[PDB]
Structures are given as structure tokens and as C-alpha cells.
mmCIF file of C-alpha atoms in Angstrom:
data_model
loop_
_atom_site.group_PDB
_atom_site.id
_atom_site.type_symbol
_atom_site.label_atom_id
_atom_site.label_comp_id
_atom_site.label_asym_id
_atom_site.label_seq_id
_atom_site.Cartn_x
_atom_site.Cartn_y
_atom_site.Cartn_z
ATOM 1 C CA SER G 1 57.637 153.590 86.662
ATOM 2 C CA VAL G 2 59.603 150.538 87.425
ATOM 3 C CA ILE G 3 57.172 149.491 90.170
ATOM 4 C CA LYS G 4 54.649 147.515 88.027
ATOM 5 C CA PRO G 5 51.362 146.115 89.060
ATOM 6 C CA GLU G 6 52.688 142.452 89.324
ATOM 7 C CA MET G 7 56.398 141.801 90.707
ATOM 8 C CA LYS G 8 58.502 139.198 91.633
ATOM 9 C CA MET G 9 60.802 138.596 94.812
ATOM 10 C CA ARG G 10 64.049 136.428 95.256
ATOM 11 C CA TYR G 11 65.315 135.969 98.737
ATOM 12 C CA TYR G 12 68.686 134.971 100.669
ATOM 13 C CA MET G 13 69.593 135.640 104.097
ATOM 14 C CA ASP G 14 73.013 134.590 106.051
ATOM 15 C CA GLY G 15 71.838 134.613 109.871
ATOM 16 C CA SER G 16 72.825 133.110 113.208
ATOM 17 C CA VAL G 17 70.339 132.586 116.160
ATOM 18 C CA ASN G 18 71.889 131.603 119.618
ATOM 19 C CA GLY G 19 75.060 130.502 117.726
ATOM 20 C CA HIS G 20 73.158 128.238 115.346
ATOM 21 C CA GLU G 21 74.127 129.460 111.554
ATOM 22 C CA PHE G 22 71.654 128.868 108.834
ATOM 23 C CA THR G 23 70.891 130.503 105.412
ATOM 24 C CA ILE G 24 67.637 130.646 103.889
ATOM 25 C CA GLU G 25 66.474 130.938 100.010
ATOM 26 C CA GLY G 26 63.106 131.790 98.576
ATOM 27 C CA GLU G 27 61.076 133.471 96.249
ATOM 28 C CA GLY G 28 57.553 135.031 95.980
ATOM 29 C CA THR G 29 55.169 137.347 93.673
ATOM 30 C CA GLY G 30 53.418 140.618 95.001
ATOM 31 C CA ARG G 31 51.434 143.327 94.005
ATOM 32 C CA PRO G 32 53.256 146.291 95.352
ATOM 33 C CA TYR G 33 50.184 149.019 94.956
ATOM 34 C CA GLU G 34 47.894 146.363 96.799
ATOM 35 C CA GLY G 35 50.588 145.911 99.376
ATOM 36 C CA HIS G 36 50.578 142.449 99.014
ATOM 37 C CA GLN G 37 53.082 139.710 98.886
ATOM 38 C CA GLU G 38 52.997 135.778 99.028
ATOM 39 C CA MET G 39 56.653 133.493 99.209
ATOM 40 C CA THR G 40 57.962 130.480 100.024
ATOM 41 C CA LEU G 41 60.694 130.092 102.048
ATOM 42 C CA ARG G 42 63.511 127.583 102.798
ATOM 43 C CA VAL G 43 65.473 127.207 105.767
ATOM 44 C CA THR G 44 68.946 124.992 105.713
ATOM 45 C CA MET G 45 70.579 124.742 108.991
ATOM 46 C CA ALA G 46 74.637 124.952 108.660
ATOM 47 C CA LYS G 47 75.078 121.376 110.650
ATOM 48 C CA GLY G 48 71.469 120.019 109.030
ATOM 49 C CA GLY G 49 68.163 119.019 110.371
ATOM 50 C CA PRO G 50 65.265 121.166 111.868
ATOM 51 C CA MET G 51 65.503 124.694 112.657
ATOM 52 C CA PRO G 52 65.882 124.806 116.377
ATOM 53 C CA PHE G 53 63.688 128.145 116.628
ATOM 54 C CA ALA G 54 60.313 129.816 115.621
ATOM 55 C CA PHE G 55 60.233 131.042 112.466
ATOM 56 C CA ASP G 56 58.560 134.087 113.423
ATOM 57 C CA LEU G 57 61.973 134.947 114.672
ATOM 58 C CA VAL G 58 63.050 135.865 110.889
ATOM 59 C CA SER G 59 59.628 136.181 109.228
ATOM 60 C CA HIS G 60 59.419 139.938 109.734
ATOM 61 C CA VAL G 61 62.856 140.215 107.271
ATOM 62 C CA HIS G 62 59.795 144.225 101.904
ATOM 63 C CA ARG G 63 58.015 147.908 102.033
ATOM 64 C CA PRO G 64 57.784 148.431 98.266
ATOM 65 C CA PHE G 65 54.601 146.069 99.003
ATOM 66 C CA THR G 66 52.694 148.668 101.214
ATOM 67 C CA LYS G 67 49.514 150.047 99.476
ATOM 68 C CA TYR G 68 49.997 154.056 99.942
ATOM 69 C CA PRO G 69 47.080 156.492 99.336
ATOM 70 C CA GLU G 70 48.076 159.046 96.809
ATOM 71 C CA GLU G 71 48.005 161.572 99.623
ATOM 72 C CA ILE G 72 50.927 159.955 101.425
ATOM 73 C CA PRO G 73 54.598 159.964 99.468
ATOM 74 C CA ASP G 74 55.527 156.808 98.906
ATOM 75 C CA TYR G 75 59.547 156.569 100.124
ATOM 76 C CA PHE G 76 59.665 152.978 99.243
ATOM 77 C CA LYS G 77 58.045 152.904 95.465
ATOM 78 C CA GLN G 78 60.522 156.380 95.144
ATOM 79 C CA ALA G 79 63.767 154.471 96.033
ATOM 80 C CA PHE G 80 63.409 152.363 92.903
ATOM 81 C CA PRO G 81 65.095 151.328 90.751
ATOM 82 C CA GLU G 82 68.282 152.628 92.493
ATOM 83 C CA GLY G 83 67.648 150.598 95.567
ATOM 84 C CA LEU G 84 66.384 150.523 99.352
ATOM 85 C CA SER G 85 68.435 148.890 102.244
ATOM 86 C CA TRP G 86 66.816 148.802 105.714
ATOM 87 C CA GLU G 87 68.104 147.673 109.647
ATOM 88 C CA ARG G 88 66.391 146.743 112.290
ATOM 89 C CA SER G 89 66.521 145.900 115.900
ATOM 90 C CA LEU G 90 64.370 143.448 117.648
ATOM 91 C CA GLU G 91 64.098 143.691 121.630
ATOM 92 C CA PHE G 92 62.031 140.406 123.199
ATOM 93 C CA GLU G 93 60.555 140.534 126.684
ATOM 94 C CA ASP G 94 62.358 137.584 127.734
ATOM 95 C CA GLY G 95 65.998 139.237 127.001
ATOM 96 C CA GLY G 96 66.044 137.682 123.524
ATOM 97 C CA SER G 97 67.154 140.095 121.022
ATOM 98 C CA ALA G 98 68.410 140.509 117.437
ATOM 99 C CA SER G 99 70.235 142.553 114.720
ATOM 100 C CA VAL G 100 69.142 142.577 111.186
ATOM 101 C CA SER G 101 69.953 144.554 107.843
ATOM 102 C CA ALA G 102 68.520 143.878 104.307
ATOM 103 C CA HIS G 103 69.257 145.745 100.872
ATOM 104 C CA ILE G 104 66.832 145.276 97.919
ATOM 105 C CA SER G 105 68.113 145.486 94.612
ATOM 106 C CA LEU G 106 65.787 145.331 91.356
ATOM 107 C CA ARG G 107 66.717 143.566 88.053
ATOM 108 C CA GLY G 108 63.237 143.452 85.530
ATOM 109 C CA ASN G 109 60.356 142.976 87.336
ATOM 110 C CA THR G 110 62.474 140.850 90.363
ATOM 111 C CA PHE G 111 63.256 142.347 93.403
ATOM 112 C CA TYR G 112 66.841 140.818 95.098
ATOM 113 C CA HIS G 113 66.554 141.063 98.787
ATOM 114 C CA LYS G 114 69.969 140.120 100.733
ATOM 115 C CA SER G 115 69.851 139.989 104.634
ATOM 116 C CA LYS G 116 72.396 139.352 107.502
ATOM 117 C CA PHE G 117 70.725 138.538 110.506
ATOM 118 C CA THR G 118 72.230 137.804 114.211
ATOM 119 C CA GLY G 119 70.114 136.661 117.294
ATOM 120 C CA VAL G 120 71.887 136.603 120.883
ATOM 121 C CA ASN G 121 70.626 135.977 124.391
ATOM 122 C CA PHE G 122 67.365 134.223 123.729
ATOM 123 C CA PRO G 123 66.344 131.423 126.579
ATOM 124 C CA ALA G 124 66.858 127.914 126.203
ATOM 125 C CA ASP G 125 63.390 127.366 127.183
ATOM 126 C CA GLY G 126 61.601 130.063 126.134
ATOM 127 C CA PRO G 127 58.949 130.333 123.045
ATOM 128 C CA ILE G 128 61.396 131.124 120.219
ATOM 129 C CA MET G 129 63.943 128.582 120.933
ATOM 130 C CA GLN G 130 61.375 125.660 121.143
ATOM 131 C CA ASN G 131 59.260 126.596 118.594
ATOM 132 C CA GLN G 132 56.157 127.726 120.586
ATOM 133 C CA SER G 133 55.013 130.917 118.649
ATOM 134 C CA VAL G 134 52.845 130.542 115.702
ATOM 135 C CA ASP G 135 52.529 133.937 114.185
ATOM 136 C CA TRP G 136 52.953 137.369 114.883
ATOM 137 C CA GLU G 137 49.834 139.490 115.522
ATOM 138 C CA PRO G 138 48.544 142.388 113.019
ATOM 139 C CA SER G 139 50.097 145.635 113.837
ATOM 140 C CA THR G 140 50.367 149.172 113.244
ATOM 141 C CA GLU G 141 53.863 150.640 112.788
ATOM 142 C CA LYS G 142 54.625 154.395 113.107
ATOM 143 C CA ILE G 143 56.983 155.503 110.237
ATOM 144 C CA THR G 144 58.484 159.254 110.971
ATOM 145 C CA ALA G 145 61.387 161.217 108.688
ATOM 146 C CA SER G 146 64.134 162.551 109.364
ATOM 147 C CA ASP G 147 66.982 164.036 107.060
ATOM 148 C CA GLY G 148 66.135 162.066 103.804
ATOM 149 C CA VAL G 149 65.386 158.558 106.272
ATOM 150 C CA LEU G 150 62.731 156.958 107.419
ATOM 151 C CA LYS G 151 62.286 155.431 111.041
ATOM 152 C CA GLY G 152 59.594 152.740 111.836
ATOM 153 C CA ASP G 153 58.853 151.993 115.672
ATOM 154 C CA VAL G 154 56.184 148.939 116.116
ATOM 155 C CA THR G 155 55.412 147.255 119.302
ATOM 156 C CA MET G 156 54.842 143.528 118.253
ATOM 157 C CA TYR G 157 53.479 140.678 119.513
ATOM 158 C CA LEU G 158 54.265 137.034 119.281
ATOM 159 C CA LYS G 159 50.969 134.656 119.210
ATOM 160 C CA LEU G 160 51.837 131.473 121.458
ATOM 161 C CA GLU G 161 50.617 127.840 121.279
ATOM 162 C CA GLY G 162 47.722 127.500 123.727
ATOM 163 C CA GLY G 163 47.293 131.260 123.639
ATOM 164 C CA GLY G 164 49.505 133.877 125.285
ATOM 165 C CA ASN G 165 51.282 136.928 124.144
ATOM 166 C CA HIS G 166 55.278 137.492 124.209
ATOM 167 C CA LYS G 167 56.357 141.041 122.999
ATOM 168 C CA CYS G 168 58.977 142.565 121.298
ATOM 169 C CA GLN G 169 59.972 145.525 120.224
ATOM 170 C CA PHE G 170 61.244 146.659 116.937
ATOM 171 C CA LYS G 171 63.275 149.580 115.954
ATOM 172 C CA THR G 172 63.759 150.002 112.188
ATOM 173 C CA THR G 173 65.501 152.423 109.525
ATOM 174 C CA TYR G 174 64.967 152.770 106.213
ATOM 175 C CA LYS G 175 67.377 153.870 103.858
ATOM 176 C CA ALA G 176 66.557 154.990 99.977
ATOM 177 C CA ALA G 177 70.170 154.335 97.900
ATOM 178 C CA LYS G 178 69.393 157.561 96.223
ATOM 179 C CA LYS G 179 68.237 161.046 97.643
ATOM 180 C CA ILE G 180 64.148 160.757 97.540
ATOM 181 C CA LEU G 181 62.636 163.669 95.888
ATOM 182 C CA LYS G 182 59.387 164.042 97.971
ATOM 183 C CA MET G 183 59.383 162.918 101.846
ATOM 184 C CA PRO G 184 56.340 161.700 103.682
ATOM 185 C CA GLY G 185 55.514 163.394 106.980
ATOM 186 C CA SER G 186 54.541 161.184 109.878
ATOM 187 C CA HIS G 187 52.275 158.136 109.318
ATOM 188 C CA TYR G 188 51.585 154.543 110.077
ATOM 189 C CA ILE G 189 51.537 151.540 108.150
ATOM 190 C CA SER G 190 48.964 148.521 109.496
ATOM 191 C CA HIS G 191 50.330 145.452 108.708
ATOM 192 C CA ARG G 192 49.347 141.619 108.723
ATOM 193 C CA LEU G 193 52.018 138.953 108.387
ATOM 194 C CA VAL G 194 50.981 135.253 108.282
ATOM 195 C CA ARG G 195 52.929 132.157 108.101
ATOM 196 C CA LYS G 196 52.302 128.189 107.540
ATOM 197 C CA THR G 197 55.231 125.999 108.221
ATOM 198 C CA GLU G 198 56.307 122.767 107.159
ATOM 199 C CA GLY G 199 59.178 122.191 109.117
ATOM 200 C CA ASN G 200 62.317 123.926 107.481
ATOM 201 C CA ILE G 201 59.730 125.251 104.425
ATOM 202 C CA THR G 202 57.617 128.072 105.181
ATOM 203 C CA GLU G 203 54.683 130.264 103.161
ATOM 204 C CA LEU G 204 54.401 133.642 104.435
ATOM 205 C CA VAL G 205 51.838 136.569 103.174
ATOM 206 C CA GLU G 206 52.147 139.739 104.208
ATOM 207 C CA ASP G 207 49.242 142.750 103.794
ATOM 208 C CA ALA G 208 50.209 146.314 104.673
ATOM 209 C CA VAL G 209 48.553 149.414 103.979
ATOM 210 C CA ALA G 210 49.739 152.823 105.160
ATOM 211 C CA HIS G 211 47.485 155.577 106.459
ATOM 212 C CA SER G 212 47.785 159.036 108.184
#
């Protein structure tokens, strides 16, 4: 098996939100069978200076890192060595929205994760553009299968500075590069994604566990 108990990650993203272009590059380490990742990510604005949005907007942008019980087929680890891609729509409760897609490849014990992100129609005084969210709440995503691909649906909430919630619906399609021999049936993935940010540098930790 090509998925080892310790693995490494390299990340690159081309993105833009409300017209502001940026890149993100970073790296981490993780334990795929424990469903744990931790990484450091660095944002660079094309015009320079501090990023003019909350990092939660892109933090959710690596399913091999999910603890799967033996009794649920693990599509994401089965997708390797050949590769795994995914696509996601975000719809925020204030009319902001975004589309992102990523391709994940593997060389040696290192995953290379390459993404393109476009975010539009965020209110200038809303919590994403004003950097007022601080994390996502933990969530449970429902995973369903059809025709060799998976779909995930999860109602997410930003935690706001000083206490509110702000809703975002995620709809994701997950696509193995090569046809998967053992497809799972419908199930859930429990996530806890937590960030600690200093300006344009963010440390992120995710813990994810599948269950039926």
C-alpha cells in the first residue's frame, strides 16, 4: 500500500476573491489512518500586503487523511497512487459564493495538492471581507456514491469574533483518477478543522473520521 502511516503534503493554490488575486503555498505532515493533518500555509497577495479576507474562506481547501473504519470502503486512500481530484461550491448566507477545484498527486511519501479558487459577490462589510470569522465549527458531512464518484453535502458555520454564526452550504464532488474497485455506500465524515493565524501565515489542523 502506497499510503503510509506517516505522510507529507505540499500545497499550491491560485486564487482570487472579490477581484483580489493571491497565491498560497505551504507544507505539512499527517497520519492518514488517524485522519490527522497539520500544516503551515503562507498567503501572498498579488498586490502585496495583508490578505483582505478571512482565511476560513480557503481553509477547507485532503480526504486521504480520514480515519475509515474497516467496514466502510475508503475511496480516498484507494484512489492512490493514481490520484484524486475534487470540486466544491460554497454558498454563504449573505450572497457571497465561491468555486474551487483541486488535484492531488503522490510522489514518494509526499502528496502534491494543487488548487484554483474563485470567490465572488462577498459584501464589502461582511465577515469574510472584514476578516471577522475565526474558524469553522466542527461539522458532519454526508457522503453519497453514484457512478464511481462521491458527493459530499455539509452545512458549515463560521464562528464569528464576538459570537455569532454565519452559514455556508458546501457541495463537493470527489473523483478518483482511476476507477475504484470497492465503492462505499452512503456514510458520514465528522470534521474538526482549526486554524491559528498570524497575518498571512496560518497553521491548520484537521481531524476527520468516517462513520456510518
